[PDB]
């Protein structure tokens, strides 16, 4: 019935628990649930889900809704909830249908509801939060709106050229002012194009500003998050969330501007078509309603075909990489024909999926083309019939054709905005869910890496700083408990060298100067006395372990620890 789509590869269990919460009330963000059910890079397990259910108030350990582990769907430990007998990665399509018994072999049906848990929404309408970036710059939006209004006035005025030409300048020969009117309408069109140019400049600048603002806010909050957030996820997820700002901007800017502008456009166009002729306007409305019906019903088949394409292409690329990595083994066993046959089969599957998507596009395009062209022919036929009876004039039909184009274009654009907004909404729930996470400083005043059964030497090193929270520790410092004093003091007091070496974009003379802006340019050379990569050969700064050691000693720590 109700489901929530997964945002990443390794949160199937979190998504399933979120869906159960959706069915029974609570609507917490997936990111908060993800952190609650001990989600790691590998994924969650039944213990994580039962612990999270107990934390949320559920009393679990058959009832209609329950989460069952599924083995053979992918290699990311999928969970699928059962409704009647909702996979987040695919949707709702049923598998059991009165028992099928192919993915239940795990037999991990575990979840049931329980005692009252303060039902109610716990999330926001977060799209408004991102849309609030239009408040600091409202002059640009107003200028864009004024330019659009003038552009429409000029376009509608200029579309009556053919009517003025055929009603008066042809039947009532006036070959003296035809040149004057032609020059006037050329001037109107030139002003229209200049206004389009100016509006495009403003829209591009506004989009750039929105991109930069959202990207920088997200990056700042990511850098402010604690270490468990970085441990739980990989780098690809963070980069994808970073790239979702473009989709958020597209939603805000394009959707809002197009909605207002095209609503005004459709209202004005409908008014003028109704004034020109009622029957032709009714035919136009029928055409646009049919187009809206036809486009809407094909969006979800198109999305499903696209998802199948993505999945099949991912499988093919994985197979190709697995074949290339290990080409030595394929050559060693001396059998490459089998690999060619397997790749042929995978390519054929990808082609079948692409052919299905291609038929979807071709059928949609042909239906829309039938609607548009046959509606144009019907409009010409009806206009001619009305002109025969004298209701209209010869040129009023062509004026109506031009206004019809200028009225159908906005509503065609507005209806085509239905899918884009949707995906951008998803992008919001993929990005801003991170923003609700409390930062490192907010949560301040043996050991486990998250529901992972209580490199042990390294963990003690990381525990020495406030990277994590202990259960039995802090028995070496000469003072008192670490948690009761400022984090910044621990940061400037403890220096350590990681397994790898981190060097960021910048010259060597400032890589050692990382973190602090006061070096006096003498401490660097003082610390350089201990293996400065043998003075790094060239005194001229460039732009690795020796650099890390020099940075550690230059930091001047009260306590120094090294691998």
What 3-state class would DSSP assign to 234?
coil
CA distance 108 to 76: 16
Give Cα 509 distance to the centre of its chain. 39
Ligand-binding annotation for 204, yes or no, is: no
Considering only 94, 129, 300, 344, the residue that binds a copy of itself (CB under 8 A) is 344
Considering only 373, 426, 460, 545, the residue that binds a copy of itself (CB under 8 A) is 373
Query: Does 197 engage in binding with a copy of itself (CB under 8 A)?
Result: yes
Structure tokens of 493? 């007091």
Structure tokens of 102? 């192919």
Query: Does 102 engage in binding with a copy of itself (CB under 8 A)?
Result: no
Query: Does 521 engage in binding with a copy of itself (CB under 8 A)?
Result: no
Question: How many residues form the binding site for a copy of itself (CB under 8 A)?
Answer: 117
CA distance 438 to 32: 10
CA distance 467 to 137: 39
**Listed residue (26, 28, 22) closest to 4, CA to CA:** 22
Considering only 94, 129, 300, 491, the residue that binds a copy of itself (CB under 8 A) is 491
Q: What backbone torsions phi and psi does residue 66 show, to the nearest 5 degrees?
A: -160, 155
Give Cα 213 distance to the centre of its chain. 16
CA distance 400 to 178: 21
Q: What backbone torsions phi and psi does residue 68 show, to the nearest 5 degrees?
A: -120, 130
Query: Does 110 engage in binding with a copy of itself (CB under 8 A)?
Result: no
**Minimum gap (Å) between residue 54 Cβ and a copy of itself:** 32
**Minimum gap (Å) between residue 126 Cβ and a copy of itself:** 22
Residues in the chain: 563
**Minimum gap (Å) between residue 33 Cβ and a copy of itself:** 23
Query: Does 343 engage in binding with a copy of itself (CB under 8 A)?
Result: yes
Considering only 340, 474, 535, 563, the residue that binds a copy of itself (CB under 8 A) is 340
Considering only 189, 285, 298, 536, the residue that binds a copy of itself (CB under 8 A) is 189
C-beta closer to a copy of itself: residue 4 or 398: 398
Considering only 115, 471, 500, 522, the residue that binds a copy of itself (CB under 8 A) is 500
All residues at 6 or more sequence positions from 344 whose CB lies less than 8 Å from its CB, including other chains: none
Ligand-binding annotation for 459, yes or no, is: yes
H or E stretch covering 561: strand 559-561
What does the CA dihedral 379, 382, 388, 393 come to, rounded to 10 degrees?
Answer: -40
Ligand-binding annotation for 167, yes or no, is: no
Q: Tell which positions 300-329 bind a copy of itself, by CB under 8 A.
A: 317, 319-329
Considering only 215, 280, 403, 427, the residue that binds a copy of itself (CB under 8 A) is 215
CB burial string 438-472: b at 16+ within 10 A, e below: eeeeeeeeebeeebeeeeeeebebbbbbbbbebee
Query: Does 220 engage in binding with a copy of itself (CB under 8 A)?
Result: yes
Query: Does 447 engage in binding with a copy of itself (CB under 8 A)?
Result: no
C-beta closer to a copy of itself: residue 200 or 469: 200
Neighbours of 344 (CB within 10 A): 10
List the x/- string, 167-186, binding to a copy of itself by CB under 8 A. --xx--x-x--xx--x--xx
CB burial string 133-152: b at 16+ within 10 A, e below: bbeeeeeebeebeebbeebb
**Minimum gap (Å) between residue 56 Cβ and a copy of itself:** 30
Q: What backbone torsions phi and psi does residue 387 show, to the nearest 5 degrees?
A: -65, -35
Tell me which stretch binds a copy of itself (CB under 8 A): 202-210, 268-276, 417-425, 428-436. 202-210
Ligand-binding annotation for 458, yes or no, is: yes
Considering only 117, 145, 447, 467, the residue that binds a copy of itself (CB under 8 A) is 467
Tell me which stretch binds a copy of itself (CB under 8 A): 40-48, 197-205, 289-297, 478-486. 197-205
CA distance 53 to 141: 46
Ligand-binding annotation for 544, yes or no, is: no
List the x/- string, 226-265, binding to a copy of itself by CB under 8 A. -x--x----xx-xx--x-----------------------
C-beta closer to a copy of itself: residue 5 or 492: 492
Considering only 9, 110, 302, 387, the residue that binds a copy of itself (CB under 8 A) is 387
Residue that the structure tokens 């999270």 belong to: 52
Considering only 4, 28, 81, 398, the residue that binds a copy of itself (CB under 8 A) is 398
**Beta strands of 200-304 (E only): which ranges?**
none
Considering only 275, 286, 362, 525, the residue that binds a copy of itself (CB under 8 A) is 362
C-beta closer to a copy of itself: residue 293 or 327: 327
List the x/- string, 60-79, binding to a copy of itself by CB under 8 A. ---------------x----
Query: Does 498 engage in binding with a copy of itself (CB under 8 A)?
Result: yes
Query: Does 224 engage in binding with a copy of itself (CB under 8 A)?
Result: yes
CA distance 227 to 467: 6
Q: Do the beta carbons of residue 143 and residue 202 sit within 8 Å?
A: yes
């Amino acid at each position: 019935y109700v489901c929530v789509r997964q945002y990443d590869l390794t949160d199937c269990g979190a998504a399933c628990l979120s869906s159960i919460a959706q069915y029974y009330g609570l609507k917490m963000s997936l990111a908060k649930i993800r952190e609650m059910t001990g989600t790691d890079t590998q994924g969650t397990n039944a213990y994580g889900l039962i612990h999270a259910a107990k934390q949320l108030g559920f009393s679990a350990k058959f009832r209609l809704p329950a989460i069952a582990n599924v083995i053979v769907d992918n290699r990311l430990a999928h969970f699928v909830v059962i409704y009647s007998i909702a996979d987040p990665g695919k949707g709702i399509v049923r598998y059991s249908m009165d028992d099928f018994c192919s993915i239940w072999t795990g037999g991990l049906v575990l979840l049931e509801p329980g005692e009252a848990f303060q039902k109610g929404d716990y999330t926001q309408n977060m799209m408004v939060k991102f849309a609030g970036f239009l408040k600091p710059l409202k002059k640009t939006v107003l200028c864009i709106f004024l330019a659009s209004l003038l552009y429409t006035a000029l376009g509608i005025a200029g579309s009556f050229y053919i009517k003025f030409l055929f009603d008066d300048l042809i039947k009532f020969e006036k070959l003296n002012d035809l040149h004057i009117i032609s020059a006037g309408f050329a001037v109107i069109f030139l002003l229209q194009i200049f206004l389009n140019y100016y509006r495009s400049i403003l829209v591009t600048k506004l989009g750039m500003s929105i991109d930069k603002s959202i990207m920088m806010e997200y990056y700042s909050h990511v850098l402010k998050l604690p270490m468990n957030f970085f441990n739980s996820r990989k780098v690809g997820e963070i980069i994808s969330r970073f790239m979702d700002a473009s989709k958020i901007r597209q939603a805000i800017s394009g959707a809002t501007l197009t909605i207002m502008i095209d609503t005004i456009m459709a209202v004005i166009g409908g008014i003028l078509l109704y004034i020109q002729n009622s029957s032709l306007f009714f035919i136009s409305f029928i055409i646009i309603l049919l187009y809206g019906i036809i486009v809407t019903v094909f969006n979800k088949p198109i999305q499903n075909a696209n998802r199948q394409i993505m999945e099949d292409n991912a499988k093919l690329t994985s197979a190709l990489v697995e074949s290339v990595k290990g080409i030595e083994t394929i050559k060693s066993f001396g059998a490459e024909e089998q690999t060619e046959k397997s790749t042929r089969d995978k390519i054929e599957t990808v082609m079948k999926s692409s052919f299905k998507e291609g038929m979807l596009y071709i059928n949609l395009s042909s239906l829309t083309g039938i609607v548009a062209g046959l509606g144009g022919i019907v409009i010409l036929w009806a206009g001619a019939y009305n002109v025969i009876k004298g209701n209209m004039s010869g040129g009023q039909l062509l004026a109506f054709n031009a206004l019809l184009a200028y009225f159908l274009t906005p509503v065609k654009n507005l209806i085509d905005l239905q899918p884009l907004i949707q995906t951008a909404v998803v992008a919001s729930n993929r990005l801003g869910e991170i923003l609700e996470l409390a930062t490192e400083k907010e949560l301040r005043e043996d050991f486990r890496y998250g529901l992972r059964k209580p490199s042990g030497k390294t963990t003690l090193a990381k525990l020495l700083m406030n990277f994590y929270s202990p259960e039995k520790g802090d028995i070496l410092i000469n003072g008192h408990s670490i948690k009761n004093i400022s984090l910044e003091l621990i940061r400037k007091k403890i220096a350590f060298v990681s397994q790898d070496v981190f060097i960021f974009s910048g010259t060597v003379k400032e890589n050692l100067c990382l973190g602090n802006e006061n070096v006096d340019m003498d401490e660097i050379i003082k610390a350089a006395k201990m293996a400065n990569a043998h003075d790094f050969i060239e005194k001229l700064p460039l732009k690795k372990q020796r650099l890390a050691i020099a940075r550690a000693l230059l930091k001047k720590p009260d306590i120094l620890i090294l691998d």
